[PDB]
Design a protein around this motif. Structure first.
Motif, PDB file in Angstrom:
ATOM      1  N   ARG A 156       0.759  -1.173   0.126  1.00 44.46           N
ATOM      2  CA  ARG A 156       0.023  -0.162  -0.072  1.00 44.46           C
ATOM      3  C   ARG A 156       0.786   1.274  -0.147  1.00 44.46           C
ATOM      4  O   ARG A 156       0.381   2.285  -0.138  1.00 44.46           O
TER       5      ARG A 156
ATOM      6  N   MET B 191       3.807   1.619  -1.818  1.00 40.59           N
ATOM      7  CA  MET B 191       4.572   1.645  -2.873  1.00 40.59           C
ATOM      8  C   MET B 191       4.430   3.145  -3.596  1.00 40.59           C
ATOM      9  O   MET B 191       5.548   3.621  -4.025  1.00 40.59           O
ATOM     10  N   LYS B 192       3.334   3.660  -3.413  1.00 41.40           N
ATOM     11  CA  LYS B 192       3.034   5.011  -3.982  1.00 41.40           C
ATOM     12  C   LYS B 192       3.939   6.144  -3.323  1.00 41.40           C
ATOM     13  O   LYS B 192       4.439   6.967  -4.285  1.00 41.40           O
ATOM     14  N   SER B 193       4.185   6.054  -2.251  1.00 40.63           N
ATOM     15  CA  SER B 193       5.299   6.744  -1.700  1.00 40.63           C
ATOM     16  C   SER B 193       6.634   6.343  -1.705  1.00 40.63           C
ATOM     17  O   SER B 193       7.728   7.256  -1.733  1.00 40.63           O
TER      18      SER B 193
ATOM     19  N   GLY C 246       9.611   6.850  -7.146  1.00 40.05           N
ATOM     20  CA  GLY C 246       9.112   7.979  -8.113  1.00 40.05           C
ATOM     21  C   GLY C 246      10.382   8.720  -8.153  1.00 40.05           C
ATOM     22  O   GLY C 246      11.606   8.448  -7.409  1.00 40.05           O
TER      23      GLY C 246
ATOM     24  N   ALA D  64       6.749   3.573 -11.252  1.00 37.24           N
ATOM     25  CA  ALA D  64       5.443   3.554 -11.068  1.00 37.24           C
ATOM     26  C   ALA D  64       4.847   3.029 -12.338  1.00 37.24           C
ATOM     27  O   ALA D  64       3.859   1.952 -12.344  1.00 37.24           O
ATOM     28  N   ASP D  65       5.176   3.518 -13.530  1.00 34.55           N
ATOM     29  CA  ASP D  65       4.704   3.209 -14.519  1.00 34.55           C
ATOM     30  C   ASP D  65       4.920   1.805 -15.002  1.00 34.55           C
ATOM     31  O   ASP D  65       3.916   1.061 -15.751  1.00 34.55           O
TER      32      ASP D  65
ATOM     33  N   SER E 294       5.823  -0.725 -12.974  1.00 36.81           N
ATOM     34  CA  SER E 294       5.049  -1.712 -12.140  1.00 36.81           C
ATOM     35  C   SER E 294       3.620  -1.957 -12.787  1.00 36.81           C
ATOM     36  O   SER E 294       3.107  -3.038 -12.747  1.00 36.81           O
ATOM     37  N   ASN E 295       2.921  -0.761 -13.020  1.00 30.54           N
ATOM     38  CA  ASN E 295       1.514  -0.860 -13.280  1.00 30.54           C
ATOM     39  C   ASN E 295       1.324  -1.835 -14.955  1.00 30.54           C
ATOM     40  O   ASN E 295       0.451  -2.475 -14.898  1.00 30.54           O
TER      41      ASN E 295
ATOM     42  N   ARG F  73      -0.837   1.415 -20.058  1.00 29.61           N
ATOM     43  CA  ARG F  73      -0.971   2.104 -18.527  1.00 29.61           C
ATOM     44  C   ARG F  73       0.414   2.931 -18.663  1.00 29.61           C
ATOM     45  O   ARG F  73       0.514   3.314 -17.346  1.00 29.61           O
TER      46      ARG F  73
END
Lengths: 250, 214, 110, 153, 153
Positions: free
Chosen positions: A144, A146-148, A151, A160-161, A163-164, A238
């Motif tokens: 949860r 990972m967003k922080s 980058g 991030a790109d 991974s998605n 994505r």
């Protein structure tokens, strides 16, 4: 590394303080000596069993599935002694490792743990029987934070790109593989074959690593791109066009 | 009926959970089979709609061409009907592996035995030759037409049978497994409670005995 | 080699196909076709249709629509796949559309 | 230990585990679709995995031949069965998308006596028969299989 | 006891249980198939079993006619229901292999009046209509059925 070993034949009460000593050390090192400490608590299920024994020693009536009614706060007492604090440059992270009794994620041990932790890694069995190491299944896992974590200024712009897009490609490849088992190879279209090729090379090159190869975050992303460049730009839905133009070629 | 009627146990939980996962996986795999059959069916539906229309137009041209051959020759139909021995065109059976289901299709086979050479009536050979070609085209279309129709009927049965099985899993078998699993979980918690009650009273009786000793 | 196409239809329809190169005699000198004239009765058409269904060398049968109407019960009664039956417009009868098996099977088609 | 004495066991062990797990996953779908669509390699996995389950992982421990199977023999049996797997897989994948496509059905008809020999390997009966001969006999099966695929391809 | 006073009761009891058990064995699968694979002999079981369920096994105890069911009436009306079963099952078993099979739809339309009369057999009011009328009524329905089959088959 500061290593604590509590053996299966050691006193069961000592097993209860062992993680308390590990965190006590972690708190000293992290917060008083301004450094970052990674704390790994292995076999919390064995801790939980020792805790149940202590409850019986106190002649307490067992709770749900035989465990103490205070197992929730006891696990939180250990788990939550971590994180960053204002005004200091140290930190504590944790990677508790838990054996699932009867491989049932519903069992109080992984359930009470996961209920108060942030995501899960989740090691599977099918990947192990297929002789893949590490046997980690990326579809049921989650971080949860990972967003922080990632980058620009922390890892790389495209983290991030990548991974998605990889997650979607793996999930689709599994879906196509399931289709292949029903319709055959000749019934697949070109896009499906690309997802099948991705699935096979994704697990062989990206997930399969070996115990003695250390892949840094930047090499991991570059390996990701090697898998993503299987697809033409138009299928990488994505990843924003700006990211593709910088990283996709070459 | 409402439950599989397996006595509540932790063993039942493991079996039911594995049984549920199996049923859910089968539902998805059969749904994929249905989707594959539906696409081919719909593609086959469009192919049949294009064919049948064309068949009409081709027969219109062939019938006119026949009238032209008749105009020149007069009564060639009598000779053609009586003087028949071998066919030039024959049909071979082929299998179409559209999915797990295999459908029968016809394939045009140009065997090659020579047709009758007819210049006897007014020597209208050019009109008869155009007429042969016009019908030859009709024959090939009709072969495709049937073949598409046979594969189509077999697939339509395949779609209804697959969808019926998928619907039963969703509306009959899984609901029943889920009711069984929920029943098992509830009854097991009920057994835990009565064990709690007895153990609590045992602890209280022990304390009471200890007080008496003081 | 495998299968023959049998034709039951009027004089021009059968003649055209025979010129088309389709149709032949069996080893028993039987023809896999029938010419249906104004004097041809129902039993002759129906018995012929059934026999073609009873032959393993035939399969596709080509019939004129107006004939299918005369012996319609036999074409709906038998539901299989060898005997794929195609109904075609005669020289004078108009283009078929109604009562077509396929238009009936599919509820999304004209 | 295995790399010191044998060098072959570890990689055979890895492949054996892959085949057994692959069979379980293929079995799950075959029970549903009836083998309607299988890759040629998938058909080989199912049939070699049955060879393994019936003629390697199954034994009658009350018979002179299977009261105890010495390790050199256990690895011998597995080595040949996997060697077959790799050669059968190469043949069908190498000739795939070509004219003379090789399939498992073609392999079984071409070298059916190889599967008979492989299924018979449990019966060499150690101690009654010698170690040197049993190893030589298994070498002969490998040589026969290798020549069988050479003539098939 | 039954042999001394009735005799016919025991084989009727057995046949009735076999019909109910067969219907249950079918219902388990019919719910999944949709009555597509049923043989004509099985449709007879399913419909006669319904006949037994709705008219024989249930009764409204707050009515003048079902408030009491003298035993002779229970076995009497069961005899007719089973006799129908045997005649219907024989009718199809002897014709299924001929050039005209007596399927359920043919017997249903030909004997539709019998199926209604069979359902009405409960409405006999043993207090108003005594044993003599009930036995005569049941005997007449049996004869009516037997004549219908003779004209059907």
């Amino acid at each position: 590394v500061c290593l604590f070993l509590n053996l299966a034949n050691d006193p069961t009460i000592e097993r209860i303080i062992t993680p308390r000593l590990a965190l006590t050390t972690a708190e000293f090192l992290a917060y008083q000596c301004e450094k970052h400490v990674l704390v790994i608590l292995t076999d919390m299920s064995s801790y939980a069993e020792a805790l149940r024994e202590v409850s019986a020693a106190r002649e307490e009536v067992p709770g749900r599935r035989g465990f103490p009614g205070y197992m929730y706060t006891d696990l939180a007492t250990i788990y939550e002694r971590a994180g960053r604090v204002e005004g200091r440059n140290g930190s504590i992270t944790q990677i508790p490792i838990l054996t699932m009794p009867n491989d049932d994620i519903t069992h109080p041990i992984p359930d009470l743990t996961g209920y108060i932790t942030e995501g899960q890694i989740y090691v599977d069995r099918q990947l192990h029987n297929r002789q893949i190491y590490p046997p980690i299944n990326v579809l049921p896992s989650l971080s949860r934070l990972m967003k922080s974590a990632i980058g620009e200024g922390m890892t790389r712009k495209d983290h991030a790109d990548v991974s998605n897009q990889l997650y979607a490609c793996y999930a689709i490849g599994k879906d196509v593989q399931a289709m292949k088992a029903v319709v055959g190879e000749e019934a697949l279209t070109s896009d499906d074959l690309l997802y099948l090729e991705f699935l096979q090379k994704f697990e062989k090159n990206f997930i399969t690593q070996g115990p003695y190869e250390n892949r840094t975050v930047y090499e991991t992303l570059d390996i990701g791109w090697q898998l993503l460049r299987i697809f033409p730009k138009e299928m990488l839905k994505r990843i924003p066009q700006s990211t593709l133009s910088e990283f996709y070629p070459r | 009926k409402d439950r599989i009627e397996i006595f509540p146990s932790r063993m039942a939980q493991t079996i039911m959970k594995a049984r549920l996962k199996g049923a859910q996986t089968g539902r998805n795999l059969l749904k994929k089979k249905s989707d594959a059959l539906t696409l081919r069916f719909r593609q086959i539906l469009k192919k049949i709609i294009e064919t049948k229309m064309l068949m009409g137009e081709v027969m219109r041209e062939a019938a006119f061409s026949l009238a032209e051959a008749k105009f020149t020759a007069g009564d060639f139909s009598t000779t053609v009907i009586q003087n028949v021995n071998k066919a030039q065109v024959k049909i071979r059976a082929k299998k179409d592996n559209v999915a797990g289901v295999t459908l029968p299709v016809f394939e045009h086979y140009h065997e090659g035995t020579d047709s009758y050479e007819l210049t006897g009536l007014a020597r209208g050979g050019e009109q008869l030759a155009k007429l042969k070609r016009n019908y030859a085209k009709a024959v090939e279309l009709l072969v495709e037409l049937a073949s598409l129709q046979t594969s189509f009927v077999t697939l339509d049965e395949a779609i209804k049978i697959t969808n019926r099985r998928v619907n039963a899993i969703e509306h009959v078998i899984i609901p029943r497994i889920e009711r069984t699993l929920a029943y098992i979980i509830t009854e097991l918690d009920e057994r835990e409670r009565e064990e709690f009650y007895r153990l609590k009273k045992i602890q209280e009786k022990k304390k009471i005995i200890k007080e008496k000793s003081e | 080699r495998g299968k023959l196409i049998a034709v039951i239809g009027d004089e021009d329809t059968v003649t055209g196909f025979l010129l088309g190169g389709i149709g032949e005699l069996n080893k028993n000198r039987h023809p896999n076709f029938l010419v249906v004239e104004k004097d041809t009765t129902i039993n002759e058409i129906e018995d012929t249709f059934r026999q073609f269904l009873n032959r393993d060398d035939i399969g596709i049968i080509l019939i004129n629509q107006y004939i299918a109407e005369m012996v319609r019960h036999a074409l709906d009664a038998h539901q299989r796949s060898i005997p794929a039956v195609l109904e075609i417009p005669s020289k004078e009868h108009p283009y078929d559309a109604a009562k077509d098996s396929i238009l009936r099977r599919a509820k999304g088609m004209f | 230990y295995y790399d010191k004495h044998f060098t072959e066991f570890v990689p055979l062990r890895t492949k054996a585990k892959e085949i057994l797990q692959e069979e379980e996953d293929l079995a799950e779908i075959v029970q549903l679709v009836g083998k309607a669509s299988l890759a040629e390699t998938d058909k080989i996995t199912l049939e070699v995995a049955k060879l393994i389950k019936d003629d390697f992982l199954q034994q009658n421990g009350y018979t002179p031949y299977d009261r105890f199977c010495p390790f050199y023999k256990t690895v011998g049996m597995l080595s040949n069965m996997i060697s077959f797997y790799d050669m059968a897989r190469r043949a069908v994948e190498t000739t795939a998308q070509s004219d003379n496509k090789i399939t498992w059905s073609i392999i079984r008809e071409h070298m059916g006596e190889i599967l008979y020999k492989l299924s018979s390997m449990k019966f060499k009966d150690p101690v009654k028969d010698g170690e040197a001969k049993i190893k030589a006999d298994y070498a002969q099966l490998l040589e026969d299989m290798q020549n069988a695929f050479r003539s098939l391809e």
